[PDB]
């Protein structure tokens, strides 16, 4: 019963090359055939290829032949996936996936296409943009729109890169009744999401609202006071 | 060259009920067909393989049926945790040229809930930046189908703006749209009224919520 570990998410620029690692542990390495399955944001699984490890042979996906390679280091027990000539569309979460094959070290081999063990997934952003912390802008609580019960307000993390971004309200307390939207890619090449929390108006002016946005990539942690302005 | 089409692009159904998914294949893939389940932000999950055999440690409610070019992952009394996108994988040809289905979202169908539109103007600080961002939230609603329109000075202009629905929630099990008209500084100042028209299914009638610069 193996556990697959992957290399870190990498931000590569167009026309470049990226190599993602995948540590295989918990069982006999050569008894597994590993497959890389990529998935672009919003998109769905796309078979990238599979390496019949023990044999050290790997077959690939038509639309990738030439620009992709799958190799395995039996010594360190790792599998690698290399894509060269990166395009923007290559931007996706590259999954490492494996399946048991049988006493392959003994000649037995099921050569299974499905994937029983999956990796945590490694995200690769292939874009011409540059790493840059975000900028949080408070969303004035609808004081002249909603009343009587509760009012909704929030933040607007705009122009950040590469990804991803975490969000919490009031240092991490008011995480309830909040709808943090998936980021969105702007024409510039940057992303921008939004976080909101519909809370009672009678609490505007005592509980200084502050969304806590973090962006490890840029190593820029931001806090913004959402005063009922 | 094999195409795997999962007809039900989206399937809204309620917990306890029986959900059915159908994967359609180009040529015959015999029985080399597997089914996966993916939670937003998670590695897929091998449910069924070889068409009709569940993976070690998987709820018996998931039924794997089919053979040839017609497979079916039918589920008895669907479960709260059973919400996810489902994928079928074809792995019968050789050389290896495996293909995936395009998917199927097994969303929870509930009561048609109307959206409470909150229009947020562009913070002056953000305007001092060089641009303006008007956020028109659409809280808690269901059928993710919610057409929104950005009317600037009653101008149906439809362009510089970008939506973003949220996943199905936990408790409420609703969606929340988020349309954002990002204008300039010199053009934001060039327009007076900024309206956001939400035309939802659960909305008795169109609901325009706007504001005038100030």
Domain boundaries, chain A: 1-128, 129-228
Q: Which CATH superfamily is domain A1-128 in?
A: Immunoglobulins (2.60.40.10)
Query: Would you call A140 and B121 a contact, using CB atoms and an 8 Å cutoff?
Result: yes
Query: Do B98 and B28 share a domain, yes or no?
Result: yes
Measured between beta carbons, which residues in chain B are less than 8 angstroms from residue A62?
A: 97
Query: Do B69 and B38 share a domain, yes or no?
Result: yes
Measured between beta carbons, which residues in chain B are less than 8 angstroms from residue A47?
A: 89, 97-100
DSSP letter (8 states) at residue A111: -
Q: Are A116 and A49 in contact (CB under 8 A)?
A: no
Q: A78 forms bridges with which residues in the sheet?
A: A23, A73
Measured between beta carbons, which residues in chain A are less than 8 angstroms from residue B164?
A: 181-184, 193-194
Which of A179, A189, A211, A225 best probes binding to B when mutated, by most B CB atoms within 10 angstroms? A179
From B72, B92, B110, the end of a domain falls on B110
B82: Cα within 13 Å, side-chain hemisphere: 27
Experimental method: cryo-EM
> Which CATH number does the domain A129-228 belong to among 2.60.40.10, 3.90.1170.40, 1.25.40.10, 3.30.390.10?
2.60.40.10
Element (H, E) at A219: none
Which residues, 6+ apart, have CB-to-CB distance to A98 below 8 Å? A2, A4, A24, A32, A33, A34, A35, A79, A115, A116, A117, A118
User: What is the distance of C-alpha B43 from the center of its chain?
Assistant: 18
Q: How far apart are CA A39 and CA A49, in angstroms?
A: 13
Residue A197: closest C-alpha in chain B:
B139
Q: Are A18 and A87 in contact (CB under 8 A)?
A: no
* Residue range(s) defining the domain that contains residue B121: 111-213
A220: Cα within 13 Å, side-chain hemisphere: 16
CA-to-CA separations, A102 to A43, A54, A105, B1, in angstroms, rounded: 33, 11, 8, 29
Put simply, the chain A residues between 166 and 225 with a CB less than 8 A from any chain B CB are 179-184, 186, 192-194, 196, 198
**Could you give the residue ranges of the DSSP H alpha helices within chain B?**
124-129
Asked if domains A1-128 and A129-228 share a fold, the reply is: yes
Q: How far apart are CA A96 and CA A35, in angstroms?
A: 6
Query: Do B134 and B80 share a domain, yes or no?
Result: no
Q: Are A124 and A39 in contact (CB under 8 A)?
A: no
Query: Would you call A145 and B139 a contact, using CB atoms and an 8 Å cutoff?
Result: no
Q: What is the domain count for chain B?
A: 2
Residue A114 sits at φ, ψ, to 5 deg, of -65, 170
Element (H, E) at A153: strand A150-155
Query: Do B154 and B201 share a domain, yes or no?
Result: yes
Q: How far apart are CA B58 and CA B191, in angstroms?
A: 58
B13: left (phi over 0), alpha (psi -120 to 50) or beta: beta
DSSP letter (8 states) at residue A158: B
Q: How far apart are CA A100 and CA B55, in angstroms?
A: 12
Query: Do B159 and B84 share a domain, yes or no?
Result: no
DSSP letter (8 states) at residue A113: -
Q: Are A112 and A101 in contact (CB under 8 A)?
A: yes
DSSP secondary structure letters along B101-162: ----EEEEP---PPPEEEEE---HHHHHHT-EEEEEEEEEESSS-EEEEEEETTB----SB-
CA-to-CA separations, A190 to A19, A30, A160, B2, B188, in angstroms, rounded: 23, 42, 6, 35, 21
Query: Do B1 and B105 share a domain, yes or no?
Result: yes
Resolution in A: 23.0
Q: What is the CATH number of the domain that holds B59?
A: 2.60.40.10
Q: Looking at the complex, does the CB of residue A44 fall below 8 Å from at least one CB of chain B?
A: yes
Which residues, 6+ apart, have CB-to-CB distance to A110 below 8 Å? A100, A101, A102
Query: Do B105 and B150 share a domain, yes or no?
Result: no
Query: Would you call B118 and A142 a contact, using CB atoms and an 8 Å cutoff?
Result: yes
Query: Do B86 and B16 share a domain, yes or no?
Result: yes
């Amino acid at each position: 019963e193996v556990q697959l570990v992957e290399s870190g998410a990498e931000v590569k620029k167009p026309g470049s090359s990226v190599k993602v690692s995948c540590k295989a542990s918990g069982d006999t390495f050569i008894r597994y055939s590993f497959t890389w399955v990529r998935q672009a944001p919003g998109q769905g699984l796309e078979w990238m290829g599979r390496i019949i490890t023990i044999l050290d042979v790997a077959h690939y996906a038509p639309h990738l032949q030439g620009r992709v390679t799958i190799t395995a280091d039996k010594s360190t027990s790792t599998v690698y996936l290399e894509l060269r000539n990166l395009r923007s569309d290559d931007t996706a979460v590259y999954f490492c996936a494996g399946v048991y094959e049988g006493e392959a070290d003994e000649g037995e081999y099921d050569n299974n296409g499905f994937l029983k063990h999956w990796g945590q997934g490694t995200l690769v952003t292939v874009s011409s943009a540059s790493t840059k912390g975000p900028s949080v802008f408070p969303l004035a609580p609808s004081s002249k729109s909603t009343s009587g019960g509760t009012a909704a307000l929030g933040c607007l993390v705009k122009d950040y890169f590469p990804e991803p971004v975490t969000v919490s309200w009031n240092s991490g307390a008011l995480t309830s009744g909040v709808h943090t939207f998936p980021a969105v890619l702007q024409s510039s090449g940057l992303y921008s999401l939004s976080s909101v929390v519909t809370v009672p108006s009678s609490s505007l002016g005592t509980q200084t609202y502050i969304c806590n946005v973090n962006h490890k990539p840029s190593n820029t942690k931001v806090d913004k006071k959402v005063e009922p302005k | 060259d094999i195409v795997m089409t999962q007809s039900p692009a989206t399937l809204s159904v309620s917990p306890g009920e029986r959900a059915t998914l159908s994967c359609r294949a180009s040529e015959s893939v015999s029985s080399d067909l597997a089914w996966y389940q993916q939670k937003p932000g998670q590695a897929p999950r091998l449910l069924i393989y070889g068409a009709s055999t569940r993976a070690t440690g998987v709820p018996a409610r998931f039924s794997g049926s089919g053979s040839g070019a017609e497979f079916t992952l039918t589920i008895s009394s669907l479960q709260s945790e059973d919400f996810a996108v489902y994928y079928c994988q074809q792995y019968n040809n050789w050389p290896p040229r495996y293909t995936f289905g395009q998917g199927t979202r097994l969303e929870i169908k509930r009561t048609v809930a109307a959206p409470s539109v909150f229009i947020f103007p562009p913070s002056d600080e953000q305007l001092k930046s060089g641009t303006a961002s008007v956020v028109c939230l659409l809280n808690n609603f269901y059928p993710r189908e919610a057409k929104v329109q950005w009317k600037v000075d009653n101008a149906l202009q439809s362009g510089n703006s970008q939506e973003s629905v949220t996943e199905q929630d936990s408790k409420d099990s609703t969606y929340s749209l988020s349309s954002t008209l990002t204008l300039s500084k010199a053009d934001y100042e060039k327009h007076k009224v900024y309206a956001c028209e939400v035309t939802h299914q659960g909305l008795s009638s169109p609901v325009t919520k706007s504001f005038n610069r100030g």
